[PDB]
Design a protein around this nucleic acid. Sequence first.
RNA 1: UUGAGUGCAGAAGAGGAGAGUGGAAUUCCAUGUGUAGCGGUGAAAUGCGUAGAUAUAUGGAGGAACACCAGUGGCGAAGGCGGCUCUCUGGUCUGUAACUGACGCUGAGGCUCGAAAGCGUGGGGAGCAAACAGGAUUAGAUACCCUGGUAGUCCACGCCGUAAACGAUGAGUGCUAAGUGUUGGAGGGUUUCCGCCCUUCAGUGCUGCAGCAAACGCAUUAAGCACUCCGCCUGGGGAGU
Lengths: 66, 154, 117
Amino acid sequence: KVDYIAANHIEYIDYKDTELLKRFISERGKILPRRVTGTGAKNQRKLTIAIKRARIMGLLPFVSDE
Amino acid sequence: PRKGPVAKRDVLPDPIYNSKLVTRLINRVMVDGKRGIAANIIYNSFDIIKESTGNDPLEVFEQAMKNVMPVLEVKARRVGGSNYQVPVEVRPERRTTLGLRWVVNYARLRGEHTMEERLAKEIMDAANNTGASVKKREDTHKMADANRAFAHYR
Amino acid sequence: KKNIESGVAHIHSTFNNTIVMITDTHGNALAWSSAGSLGFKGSKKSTPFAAQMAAEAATKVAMEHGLKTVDVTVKGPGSGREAAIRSLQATGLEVTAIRDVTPVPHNGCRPPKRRRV
RNA sequence: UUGAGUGCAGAAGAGGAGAGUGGAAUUCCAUGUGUAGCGGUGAAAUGCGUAGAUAUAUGGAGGAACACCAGUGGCGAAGGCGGCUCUCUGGUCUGUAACUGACGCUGAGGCUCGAAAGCGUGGGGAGCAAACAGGAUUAGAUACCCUGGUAGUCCACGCCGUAAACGAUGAGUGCUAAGUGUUGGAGGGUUUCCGCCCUUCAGUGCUGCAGCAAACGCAUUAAGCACUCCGCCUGGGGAGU
């Protein structure tokens, strides 16, 4: 019942579209489980791979609490 | 006892000063079904009190009382199954109970060969904060809050 | 002395003890206290009263040198985490921000054995 | 040409080996502040500390495991595999129906793989911890509890070949009511369907009918109905001696 994120016919995550990517991190900086944000089955994987690539080149934080 | 609390058998006022406390104190001297004697030592002690420093047998009495009636008490409870004694918020009535109890008992050991000089001197000394009953209440309050640290959130 | 009037207060409380230290923003140490020093012993130093008194015996000294606001550092899963902050706000201070920092690893350590009692 | 296999078109995956790389955390080290405790227990003690401890801030070092995503999810023949990126590399599934024409199944001896502990040779060593030491409880405690700590745990190449190595359920193949979720697909209608509905292939869980079972229960992922090939058993001890 929770609408899928990819209603817009998106194909490639590209691990750089940080605007596109902020929908799924925790307001603290963690990751949000599928059942929480109601996402796909193969979409749950590439999301994580993208953001893990991003968390190395600095385009995203590891910890955002301070 | 096990089901629930139970009634409490209030007393009548006194036939001289008309005081529920006076009767409640006469009762706590009687031994073995013999009453009149207790009333006699009560009245004689009262007259002796009023003789030197005549104010009232009642007012100095309540003075000594408020000098005695405590405010806390160590109540041994094994919530942690151990020797935890937790300071308790003592009830109103039990306060008066203990007042009379300490007064009479600890006065019984004052030691006048005379019959009732023991009591009179005791309450007259208590009203002025000299005597172990006052020390007894202060000792209760000095063992309470002696361990209120680990025995209060219960 | 020197009236810095701007610093941070740290809180660190195990299952069996509690500490509070107040320093500046850097922060060079200013003033601290603990239930260990306040005369309590052992089986009691983990109670929500020791927290109150440690907090007081620290703040009443620290604010002398000149200090009104402070920041709050809360480590230490324990039981004074609640009483401590309020007790700071009781003796007249300006607890403003509250951040919880508890060291959580990313699974690179071996904890000890489990206890059998 | 139906079983098997190959071609052509697509799909998923913590399947494996090699080469580098990231952050958080614990610890040791350097320095600033800083004053008398820290840590531990059912209670205590041993212990570290006024040669300045715990705390706290800055930077450095080193080894190890990969927080959240994480799911009765995935892959592998089993043991098992989870940080990221690259080079080499195996297997499975759905579609089509080009092609060979039964090329199949099982499989004693043989060969290969094989958790953890263990051995050898050379490295490496942060945490944790058999042995060991000290402290406690106990009539006694060479144990449970606490403070330390050596081999080991990691890396390369060899060795050993064992687990309740479990679903205590050998492998191939075909037939016999349903309902319900979930991973990966291919088709058909509605269609913005990429959000529904219908048909089908492959795994993967729960309930349940015939049938079976000494009961407990199992039931298209049979422990039902049947054929083929292998392994094993025949009272408990003596003893896997």
